[PDB]
């Protein structure tokens, strides 16, 4: 395959990117603590947001509200209104770096996870922490809401990927369902497929693992092998039978979903990759690396 680059920012190290679901925008969260709002069709910086000290790793839009959330090495989870351009409030409680923060698509919840070994669920209407999910024994590097079930998946440097049942909180509140074992070093990332009962995880063992889950059990399907440094991030292609991963080996790698064979490697000469994401609807991807962010489409070779 080939990468058709649509937009590139040059900046200090970028840690997170989030696509707006309807506007042609991305937020970027930087190692210097600043958050940029870019229009990738015009190539214009629309706004900058400064509300953190130190790197900002978590960044996400609400799917329908004029809000985004950011999470920092200053332990803060900040909720912003991008229409009024205000920091509405800070959610305090984590006692170490926040690694990821996201909005739920239906409930008024924010999910965050932290080096303090916990996942927190907050209600952004009440501004209260409604659940602290404990059990991991090292940094929690990633957590994600399931798209249609009352589940969370999390990834930790304790070498496990945990699936948590939060049906109780929806209606004790949260119970661990699976403690997925298989990675031989810390796990940095985990993702759900948007429509299939699959999970992807990636870690310092250089492995991307594909897992399948039913209502009552789970199993490792297969492993994508080839990265030669820590894997920072992984995701499912939403509309193609493909897996994508990004790594400190300075590559983004595309893999076949059904065989886990390598399809294509894209390299940068000097930049480690820290994060990749995909637009919910469009064939549009973004990657954050040592020198900034790129927005790109993926096309078959010789198209």
Residue numbers in the entry: 1 to 171, 200 to 331
Show sentences the authors wrote.
Hence, this loss of critical proteins has the potential to compromise ER proteostasis and generate cellular stress. This challenge to normal metabolism is overcome by the activity of the cytosolic coatomer protein I (COPI) polymer, whose repeating unit is the coatomer, a 560 kDa complex of seven distinct gene products (α-, β-, β′-, γ-, δ-, ε-, and ζ-COPI)25–31. Overall, the coatomer functions to retrieve the escaped “client” proteins, such as type I membrane proteins, from cis-Golgi back to ER by retrograde trafficking. In particular, the S protein – a type I membrane protein – is delivered to the ERGIC from both the ER (by anterograde trafficking) and the Golgi (by retrograde trafficking)3,10–12. Here we utilize recombinant SARS-CoV-2 S proteins and tail peptides, including constructs with enhanced mimicry of the coatomer binding motif (clientized S protein), to elucidate the atomic structure of the S-coatomer interface.
To gain insight into the role of the basic cluster in stabilizing S-coatomer interactions, we generated alanine mutants of αWD40 Arg13, Lys15, and Arg300, which are equivalent to the β‘WD40 basic cluster residues Arg15, Lys17, and Arg272, respectively. The αWD40 Arg300Ala mutation yielded similar dissociation constants (KD) of 3.6 ± 0.4 µM and 4.2 ± 0.4 µM for wild-type and clientized Thr1273Glu S heptapeptides, respectively, and a 1.8 Å resolution crystal structure showed minimal perturbation of the binding site in this β‘WD40 mutant. This suggests that the αWD40 Arg300 side chain is important for the higher affinity for the clientized S heptapeptide. I Superposition of wild-type (white) and Arg300Ala mutant (yellow) crystal structures shows minimal perturbation near the mutation site. Site-directed mutagenesis of this basic cluster showed that an arginine at position 300 in αWD40 determines this enhanced affinity.
